[PDB]
Design a protein around this ligand. Structure first.
Ligand SMILES: Cc1ccc(CN(C(=O)N[C@@H](CS(=O)(=O)CC2CCCCC2)C(=O)O)C(=O)c2ccc(-c3ccccc3)cc2)cc1
Ligand SMILES: Cc1ccc(CN(C(=O)N[C@@H](CS(=O)(=O)CC2CCCCC2)C(=O)O)C(=O)c2ccc(-c3ccccc3)cc2)cc1
Lengths: 144, 145
């Protein structure tokens, strides 16, 4: 395709420059700032709640036969008493540990499926809360 | 609810976060994510190993709001004087990264998008034929770590 290398070269340039800027406390864009804040928040959460997070990840083990409903059931228990930014971070971290576990078990095919389940969950459940609570820009200000 | 603008940006956040978690354990979301990660790490390794020599390189270009592509190209051309290799491509990315950081430090934020476009032009004009001839970015990933 005519524009393939332009498009992938630009992607590589943007990624590398976003990374270099973030290392010095700068950001390529507002979306890059949201991504960075969420990456760091996930590390912080996983470190502070290591034992409690281990109890959560033990609740679900994805197989090629696992239905979205099983993921949605576990994630729903995480938000039964309500939503907050910390619980949203825990949701992202949970999805990340399910993907890690899938590749550990040589089921890399499940990674794209988990990503699609996470995006479905966010769309079906969490957008009204994100919007009412100032959006991802408020998360960046609260985290930083 | 319905599939609006927030669902698309939320999917982008999911992909970015999963890519980051997988990379922490030595895994990758995709081949493109693997290239991006290898280049990020190679840049860090280069900047650490050649800190003094790299400082001499970055000092060669005095960026200003009037700096043209030609001035970046002159300095970069010197870097590839003895030919192209993966290490000098890593040094080229690191150089562009340091110029962006310097621009923001000096409150000339406008130059960042100008540097990204210079890098893409230099990449397409001078380095891409060599990259295709030498196994592409996938070979760089296999060679690196
Ligand atoms: C990065 C980060 C994430 C989370 C916590 C912990 N935390 C928390 O501090 N809640 C605050 C209210 S808030 O969420 O708005 C605070 C912050 C969150 C980060 C962005 C800015 C706003 C509070 O109670 O005052 C929790 O809400 C929480 C605790 C445990 C779990 C859990 C642990 C294992 C398994 C299943 C759930 C989930 C969430 C700290 C730091
Ligand atoms: C991460 C990493 C990057 C680069 C070096 C250094 N290096 C190197 O080792 N080059 C070899 C081998 S290679 O490049 O084909 C492939 C290597 C390097 C890239 C990842 C895969 C493995 C060679 O001689 O060809 C160089 O080519 C080099 C040295 C100095 C400079 C410089 C330093 C300051 C200012 C201006 C120039 C630039 C490049 C080490 C580690």
């Amino acid at each position: 395709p005519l524009g393939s290398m332009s498009q992938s070269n630009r992607e590589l340039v943007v990624d590398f420059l976003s990374y270099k800027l973030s290392q010095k406390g700068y950001s390529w864009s507002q979306m890059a700032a949201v991504k960075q804040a969420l990456r760091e928040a996930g590390d912080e959460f996983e470190l502070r709640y290591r034992r409690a997070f281990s109890d959560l990840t033990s609740q679900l083990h994805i197989t090629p036969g696992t239905a979205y409903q099983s993921f949605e059931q576990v994630v729903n228990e995480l938000f039964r008493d309500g939503v907050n930014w910390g619980r949203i971070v825990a949701f992202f971290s949970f999805g990340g540990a399910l993907c890690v576990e899938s590749v550990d078990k040589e089921m890399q095919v499940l990674v794209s499926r988990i990503a699609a389940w996470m995006a479905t969950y966010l769309n079906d459940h969490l957008e009204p809360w994100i919007q009412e609570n100032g959006g991802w820009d408020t998360f960046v200000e609260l985290y930083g």
